[PDB]
Amino acid sequence: IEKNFVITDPRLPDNPIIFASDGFLELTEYSREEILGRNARFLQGPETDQATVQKIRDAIRDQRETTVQLINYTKSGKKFWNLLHLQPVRDQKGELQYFIGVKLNGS
Numbered sequence: 359i360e361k362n363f364v365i366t367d368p369r370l371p372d373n374p375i376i377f378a379s380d381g382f383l384e385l386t387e388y389s390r391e392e393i394l395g396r397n398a399r400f401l402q403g404p405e406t407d408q409a410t411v412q413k414i415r416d417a418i419r420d421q422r423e424t425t426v427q428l429i430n431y432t433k434s435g436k437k438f439w440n441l442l443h444l445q446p447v448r449d450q451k452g453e454l455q456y457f458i459g460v461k462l463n464g465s
């Protein structure tokens with residue numbers, strides 16, 4: 359499986375992270391207890407381009423796969439480029455269940 363990914367549940371308030379891979383915890387410097395249950399926007403900060411955040415918001419609204427790149431921050435404030443791939447996960451009836459978010463490659 360992908361080294362660095364999270365899964366969110368959009369059927370819970372504010373689309374919380376319900377799983378974060380070990381590689382995601384290592385890169386972001388947060389513990390599982392600091393990540394589970396919150397929206398992934400906490401990785402954004404002052405240099406994050408709001409035009410890209412808007413593209414993400416639109417892709418989530420329309421429930422479409424997309425790939426964007428935006429500046430994120432580790433727990434200690436280190437900036438990193440996140441080439442973020444978002445994938446909706448649907449059931450057999452076509453109903454949205456989860457989103458997968460993969461950080462593609464990278465530093």
Ligand SMILES: Cc1cc2nc3c(=O)[nH]c(=O)nc-3n(C[C@H](O)[C@H](O)[C@H](O)COP(=O)(O)O)c2cc1C
Nearest residue numbers: 365366397398399401402411414415430457458459
């Ligand atoms: C599965 C998934 C993973 C996400 N991962 C990140 C991420 O790693 N970094 C980030 O800045 N935003 C990430 N987001 C985007 C935010 O959670 C949020 O959708 C975005 O900031 C736009 O919504 P808002 O305007 O309410 O903040 C992710 C979203 C989803 C659904």
